[PDB]
Design a protein around this motif. Structure first.
Motif, PDB file in Angstrom:
ATOM      1  N   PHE A 224      -6.835  33.053 -44.563  1.00 18.70           N
ATOM      2  CA  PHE A 224      -6.195  34.507 -44.499  1.00 18.70           C
ATOM      3  C   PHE A 224      -4.614  34.260 -45.023  1.00 18.70           C
ATOM      4  N   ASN A 225      -4.094  34.871 -45.925  1.00 25.35           N
ATOM      5  CA  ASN A 225      -3.029  35.072 -46.068  1.00 25.35           C
ATOM      6  C   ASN A 225      -2.507  36.548 -46.016  1.00 25.35           C
ATOM      7  N   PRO A 226      -1.811  37.178 -45.235  1.00 29.64           N
ATOM      8  CA  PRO A 226      -1.501  38.686 -45.241  1.00 29.64           C
ATOM      9  C   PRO A 226      -0.943  39.263 -46.507  1.00 29.64           C
ATOM     10  N   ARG A 227      -0.265  38.439 -47.341  1.00 25.00           N
ATOM     11  CA  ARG A 227       0.323  39.131 -48.778  1.00 25.00           C
ATOM     12  C   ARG A 227      -0.600  38.317 -49.554  1.00 25.00           C
ATOM     13  N   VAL A 372      -3.128  26.758 -49.149  1.00 17.66           N
ATOM     14  CA  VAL A 372      -4.435  26.382 -49.093  1.00 17.66           C
ATOM     15  C   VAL A 372      -5.161  26.910 -50.331  1.00 17.66           C
TER      16      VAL A 372
ATOM     17  N   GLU C  81      -5.076  24.031 -41.215  1.00 19.29           N
ATOM     18  CA  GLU C  81      -4.640  25.483 -40.927  1.00 19.29           C
ATOM     19  C   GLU C  81      -4.877  26.299 -42.114  1.00 19.29           C
ATOM     20  N   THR C  82      -5.658  27.139 -41.976  1.00 21.78           N
ATOM     21  CA  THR C  82      -6.083  28.194 -43.128  1.00 21.78           C
ATOM     22  C   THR C  82      -5.612  29.682 -43.225  1.00 21.78           C
ATOM     23  N   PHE C  83      -5.047  30.062 -42.033  1.00 20.70           N
ATOM     24  CA  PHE C  83      -4.266  31.238 -41.817  1.00 20.70           C
ATOM     25  C   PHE C  83      -2.627  30.780 -41.713  1.00 20.70           C
ATOM     26  N   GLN C  84      -2.000  31.303 -42.717  1.00 23.17           N
ATOM     27  CA  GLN C  84      -0.959  31.139 -43.146  1.00 23.17           C
ATOM     28  C   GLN C  84       0.016  32.368 -43.827  1.00 23.17           C
ATOM     29  N   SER C  85       1.181  32.318 -43.571  1.00 18.10           N
ATOM     30  CA  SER C  85       2.129  33.333 -44.388  1.00 18.10           C
ATOM     31  C   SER C  85       3.388  32.792 -44.684  1.00 18.10           C
ATOM     32  N   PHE C  86       3.713  32.810 -45.943  1.00 16.72           N
ATOM     33  CA  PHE C  86       5.322  32.411 -46.337  1.00 16.72           C
ATOM     34  C   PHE C  86       6.105  33.655 -46.546  1.00 16.72           C
ATOM     35  N   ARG C  88       6.564  31.083 -42.238  1.00 15.70           N
ATOM     36  CA  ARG C  88       6.860  32.085 -40.976  1.00 15.70           C
ATOM     37  C   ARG C  88       5.871  31.485 -39.722  1.00 15.70           C
ATOM     38  N   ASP C  89       4.577  31.558 -39.962  1.00 16.46           N
ATOM     39  CA  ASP C  89       3.607  30.997 -39.005  1.00 16.46           C
ATOM     40  C   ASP C  89       2.397  30.449 -39.884  1.00 16.46           C
ATOM     41  N   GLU C  90       1.623  29.192 -39.316  1.00 18.69           N
ATOM     42  CA  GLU C  90       0.467  28.930 -39.960  1.00 18.69           C
ATOM     43  C   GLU C  90      -0.266  28.115 -38.605  1.00 18.69           C
ATOM     44  N   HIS C  91      -1.566  28.440 -38.619  1.00 23.39           N
ATOM     45  CA  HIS C  91      -2.192  28.026 -37.394  1.00 23.39           C
ATOM     46  C   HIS C  91      -3.793  28.206 -38.145  1.00 23.39           C
ATOM     47  N   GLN C  92      -4.651  27.702 -37.133  1.00 21.99           N
ATOM     48  CA  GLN C  92      -6.226  27.612 -37.627  1.00 21.99           C
ATOM     49  C   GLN C  92      -6.659  29.321 -37.294  1.00 21.99           C
ATOM     50  N   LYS C  93      -7.995  29.482 -37.910  1.00 27.54           N
ATOM     51  CA  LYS C  93      -8.479  30.609 -37.965  1.00 27.54           C
ATOM     52  C   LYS C  93      -8.639  31.172 -36.434  1.00 27.54           C
ATOM     53  N   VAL C 199      -0.218  37.260 -33.732  1.00 26.49           N
ATOM     54  CA  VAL C 199      -0.703  35.965 -34.546  1.00 26.49           C
ATOM     55  C   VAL C 199      -1.264  36.613 -35.970  1.00 26.49           C
ATOM     56  N   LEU C 200      -1.353  35.669 -36.781  1.00 26.38           N
ATOM     57  CA  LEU C 200      -1.841  36.155 -38.124  1.00 26.38           C
ATOM     58  C   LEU C 200      -3.658  36.266 -37.938  1.00 26.38           C
TER      59      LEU C 200
ATOM     60  N   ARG E 345      -0.379  21.763 -33.819  1.00 20.91           N
ATOM     61  CA  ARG E 345      -0.160  22.512 -34.876  1.00 20.91           C
ATOM     62  C   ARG E 345      -1.074  23.563 -35.346  1.00 20.91           C
ATOM     63  N   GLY E 346      -2.231  23.591 -34.800  1.00 22.66           N
ATOM     64  CA  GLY E 346      -3.234  24.456 -35.238  1.00 22.66           C
ATOM     65  C   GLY E 346      -2.947  25.825 -34.505  1.00 22.66           C
ATOM     66  N   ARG E 364       8.881  26.162 -32.945  1.00 26.20           N
ATOM     67  CA  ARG E 364       8.646  25.572 -34.133  1.00 26.20           C
ATOM     68  C   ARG E 364       9.152  24.215 -34.157  1.00 26.20           C
TER      69      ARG E 364
END
Lengths: 377, 377, 379, 379, 379
Positions: A224-227, A372, C81-86, C88-93, C199-200, E345-346, E364
């Protein structure tokens, strides 16, 4: 035959209108479908339409694009657990849009639309599957009715005298079971609705297998990427029966202008069906040749062969697809990104491979090196 | 090639008389045998006849129709556990009528008839089996003797000088091992009887595999109706080696006028061989077309492809058959009966499918709804 | 072993620890019945905006969401970590759960839980401390990654490290490493997020790192057994949720309509930990002595352990009767005594005649009166 | 654990319970040797026309038919009744057994046994109460579906239920439900069928529901090892009988001709429960102390537990010596000391020279004198 | 169970038995930490030309060769002798080992070891006496095939047999059978071969009989994790050495360069038996109480058990710090707390904020300062 120089956005090539819906057929003889070793069908089932019981020689995955309803899968030798004392039948599964249904070969399957909208269902049959010991094409065995091709149901192949004796019925009802004057096709209308039993030992194991899994719910995303969007994978680590069916699925939703990182499919062919929006796909083969570079839109299908490299960029409207892969636990390898082939190589290997400087090689592997699979440039 | 419009009751098409028996051959090039991907052989071994050691490229099941005797299967790398201090050899298996023997590909196998009657043995080789990496036909490698085709034993392919050096023997005995002037064929006479050692660590595991299972004994039935008959299934839940061989068997004995409920084979082709009596078989395909409707009698073979529907009714004399199926854990789905596709469907699904009333749909699923697989109308 | 139990009884939590944004009720794992079953059970209530702090346990567990909705995080070590936004935050699902969900948490994996609805979450957790996965003692050992909790106050594991090495390990200053040790926290293990918690949320990592850990069994549409005037049963084992084949536990949601019955049965390969979520019902349990070891009602919030092989029978009152059972085996199976799939229906009439000293008619009445019926017997 | 045994001794039944149509002999599961092996053993004699009433156990078992023939029923829950006749009866498939048969009964499955011959059946049963299948205590818990048995009298499980709910569950009247509870039965668990017992006998249900549960190991023609002047051995494990991979037990039939020997060996991965069915022989067992822990005869009806890894040696008397062994592992394996597949034959001569302080000639005599011979050493 | 340990401490051998050509050091398997881990550990030193006599154990084991080179023999029963010369000797295949090798010996298999170099061999052995393979008691039972050993002197198993039957079994005379019983041997289990030991050395038997039993983990070139200024880690499990999936044990070679760190971690699915082969380092271990259960140095020859789930941290001194760990599971896994694959980190930043009562910046810094780094943290 997998040595095909071109890919095209495919669409059905033959439609058969039944009383309560239509069945669209992609050309299983197309060189792309022969390469992947699959057949695909799209059906539309109007409200109150009933897809008559049948079984196929190939295992299949069904993605529900639109609508909701009930499906029935008869597991032979399993007891009837839904009952009223009045009917008795095997459990019934209620599906909605975004669901994936797994039907093993040789099992009888029926589908009913109890919603307000048509159900649109895309089906990919693995006719190359080791479970299919007939020829490499979809053989459908109808249990009731008849299908225009034409196609009679298997009971018509029995002499009515023995059909009567086997069923224990008088020859007039045995004749009725042969569905001779029926011209409704394989999707018929239940004019006054279909009422089934519905809520609102060894049979707890094999007979209670989960055959359905939702992949459209956004809350179920694996990436998931919100953008950028989201990706939701379906394999035997989510739905156990897929270790037998030997196929996987993926729901991909790209937001405006988002990209799926270039990747290749490691262990499977990928059969993608655009459910909505618009996007550009680019596919590259082992010569280094472009074999597809075009826009994909709703209702179109493209086959990306195993190991071919592939890239997608959504349009301004976004881009939604579902992919069926010809392996359980189907895997991709990204070329760039956090888990990529290039991120895993020593910088000097990149430098000597691409005749690049250290700074350029570092840009190649580290610019996207933390992202990813869904990019947003 | 599995798209065949007709089935016929098959019989051998070429016989080879040896000194102490005959070998009958069905035509592996028949379109039905190519569809199933098997070869079948029937041998008759007179008393004191010895089937010479050989190995095949395909795994096989052997059903003993008649007689008794001893079989030898050499498991390479396993120690000799039968010994006298005088001979030493690997364990020997004593078989009788009704037995099924499983011989893996690549293993040396010999058979001796120490009974009063001929041994009649039907063999179905799975030449499509993944264990066979040669071509899709029975390749038999003779270890001794010669077989009229003609067929020399593998040792004849070695120069006698090296054969002498390998065996550690003088060139005259090495020449004898090549069986040049032999004209006895592959079943020879042991004029004064054959005496073998016979009663009356890691080798306890793989080397002690059971290769033989009796299915003819009525006491072993899995399904029994005293006025209909019995069915006895053989798969890896009875005989473990079949998970590797990947084939199943079934002994079916129908009494006077009894019926086997209409069914289709879910995951295998079925190769049936009538051992006695008389019965009518009806087979239906995916068009709804009759593809066989005839009587079967002793010594005849019929191939029912996967997913085709099939029905049998015994004659007044009864009906006995053995079926070899091209899968381990081969399964059928009955159309009507206690464990049937139709018994598992909601009544309204049957009503709308067959344009029937509620009472007729209830008769269809409930008339035989308590009977398993063997009917008696 | 404590499985020579004279009597069973319905259980309720013995001790209750109140946190800032919820409470944790502990059933007594030293009770003979828990010791016979080899499990520990806890109930948690998490107020809205309450966060259960990250922690890991020595035993695999199944959590049943009795009430509420929220967000769950399970950290799988060595997964990306597959939940991420650039920008700002990244973490696992993160996993969004709801009433009726079953969550499976392997031992040794960090887990956290946030209530983002407006009603409290009520979770019932069964930990298999007899599982071969647990190589410590047969008790629930919880290792907090953050915070403190009145067991007597259990510290988080970072509190066990010296400040200087923790600073060195984390690559930070002494002040921050001290704050990680959570010295003077008074909130407990369920704490209030007053600003809400944002969270994301909407290769090989597509396989093990994408295991489903959650499955809903409360939804009526999911029934495996159903009679419109009796109720429904929904089973959860590795044929639905793959991870359970490693967790080695199964679950069952039973909903009995007014006055209905669950057919007499015994559990073949597992103990059954039964928790009543609603309604009221009569449970009778019989042991290998032919003795009645339980004969009582069950109501909301009560727990009953039914040992493997013990025969049991349930009848809902006029109000209905709902429960969730957790069983100590993957693919837990029952054997009914009467009914379509039962022991008696499989036996020859004459075996039953001679066994019970019955006439053929009486034998056939015992065998065939319910012989068509699934496990849910309509009144 | 009790496996620090100073001495072994041959065992015989401690208590004997007489029923109407047979007797059940119990070996003492509290004996150190049974506690070390983690098994319970029982011997039953079932007179002609005697029926062993249906019951189920918490532990998987192997039954060896020492004598007699008859009919066995094993009810597999959730499997269809495939034996049926219309015009009357329907039930699950029945298994006809005979001398030399081994029957495997999973825990938690109802089982019954009828002697339809004219000689008594003698069955020896070994129950693996240490099996992970058994999640109760490490003792044999038997749950009778019908009848009563002097353990002190154990009631059937239906006796644990209230009459009214049992009537409701079974859908019958109070009088019949009372008779199912078998209140005043005096027959025990083996009862006489005076009219004979008539039973019917000549999809997915073709797989698990059709598991073979019985295999004959007594038939000489089935030998795995054979020397015409020494005897024979026949092994039973999951490579012959698939269900044993779940039962986790193996069996062996050893028949030694006059004065023959079984090569010195140890059991690698299992304990051996040895029962002498005939003849007489000398058994010597050695432990890890080099101490002789057994040095005695064995005769018909006696039992000897040989612990895993203990080295043992057997020699038949002039009469021969026959036994059946039950081993606590699927694919139980032995290691011989001398012989063609043995530990010493695999070792370099010079290792043996230096190990025993022997000449090369002496080493080669120790290594090669029997180096051609299977486990049955002719006198 | 003893896993409620108040404190851990570094261990050294309690008793030492001197043989003719070496010594065997025994750690105390009755120590709470060994009893919690369910293992026994022994260290052996084998002088040049010393032969460890053939013996077999009730427990599977991993041997780590700290020092030296030599020849190992493992006899697989029922496998052919494939090393042979004619004109003299035939035996099973022999395994040549060296520093850094790990050898896996299944329970119940005869094993011997010969030092053919000129430096002493030092072997550290961990035996899993809790392994389900061991059906005896939870202690190390060693069965000598030859010789005697001061435990009190343990005899070889042939000493347990009577002379006459042993002669009969082996097919030899009384004098030779007496010598096999090794009555008056004074050498112990490591004996001197004064003439050197000469052995032969450069179907189905190509499968199980050809299992690899040895794998080198000491070679720097084999690292799985490597930082040129921090050190290296090399893992050994069934993804490298197939037999370990039956042994159910894993190993790890950790070599830390000056002042480097192993990231704080816990073992997910196993206990860790850590033995320091060189250097010096600080180890801190934390338990589920947040208590420091160890905070000390480790030096060459010392052993530390880290229980499953306990969090631990290591820092080399100025000299570096080298160890080998044996873990009580196949595919033993750790979970780091900080670093690229870690629990923190997750987790979402806001979960960490609310958990530790930290600012977003502090969160962070805790999460990303080491977020790029593998388990080896450079100083």
């Amino acid at each position: 035959e997998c040595r095909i120089e071109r890919l095209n956005a495919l669409e059905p090539t033959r439609t058969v209108r039944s009383e309560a819906g239509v069945t669209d057929y992609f050309d299983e003889d197309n060189e792309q479908f022969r390469c992947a070793g699959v057949s695909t069908i799209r059906r539309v089932i109007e409200p109150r339409g009933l897809l008559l019981p049948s079984m196929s020689n190939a295992p299949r995955l069904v993605y529900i694009v639109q609508g909701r309803g009930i499906v029935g899968l008869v597991m032979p030798g399993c007891p009837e657990t839904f009952q009223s004392f009045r009917d008795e039948h095997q459990k019934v599964y209620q599906f909605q849009e975004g669901d994936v249904l797994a039907v093993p070969n040789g099992f009888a399957y029926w589908c009913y639309n109890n919603g307000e909208n048509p159900v649109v269902a895309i089906t990919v049959l693995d006719t190359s599957n080791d479970a299919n010991q007939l020829d490499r094409s979809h053989r459908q065995f109808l249990l009731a009715g008849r299908q225009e091709q034409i196609k009679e149901n298997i009971l018509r192949g029995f002499s009515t005298e023995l059909l009567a004796a086997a069923f224990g019925v008088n020859m007039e009802l045995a004749r009725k079971l042969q569905c001779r004057d029926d011209t409704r096709g394989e999707i018929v209308r239940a004019e006054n609705g279909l009422q089934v039993l519905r809520p609102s030992g060894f049979e707890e194991t094999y007979c209670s297998m989960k055959i359905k899994q939702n992949i459209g719910d956004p809350r179920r995303a694996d990436v998931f990427n919100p953008r950028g969007g989201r990706i939701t994978t379906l394999n035997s680590e989510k739905l156990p029966i897929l270790r037998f069916i030997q196929m996987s699925a993926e729901r991909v939703v790209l937001y405006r202008n988002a990209m799926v990182s270039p990747h290749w499919n490691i262990n499977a062919h990928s059969i993608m069906y655009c459910t909505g929006g618009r996007g550009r796909v680019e596919v590259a083969d082992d010569r280094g040749e472009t074999v597809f570079d075009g826009e994909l839109r709703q209702g179109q299908l493209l086959i990306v062969p195993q190991n071919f490299a592939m890239l997608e960029r959504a349009g301004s409207e976004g881009f939604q697809l579902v992919s069926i892969k010809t392996s359980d636990r189907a895997m991709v390898s990204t070329i760039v990104g956090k888990t990529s082939a290039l991120r895993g190589m020593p910088v000097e290997v990149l430098m000597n491979s691409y005749r690049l400087s250290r700074d350029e090689a570092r840009r190649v592997k580290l610019t996207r090196g933390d992202e990813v699979a869904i990019f947003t440039p």
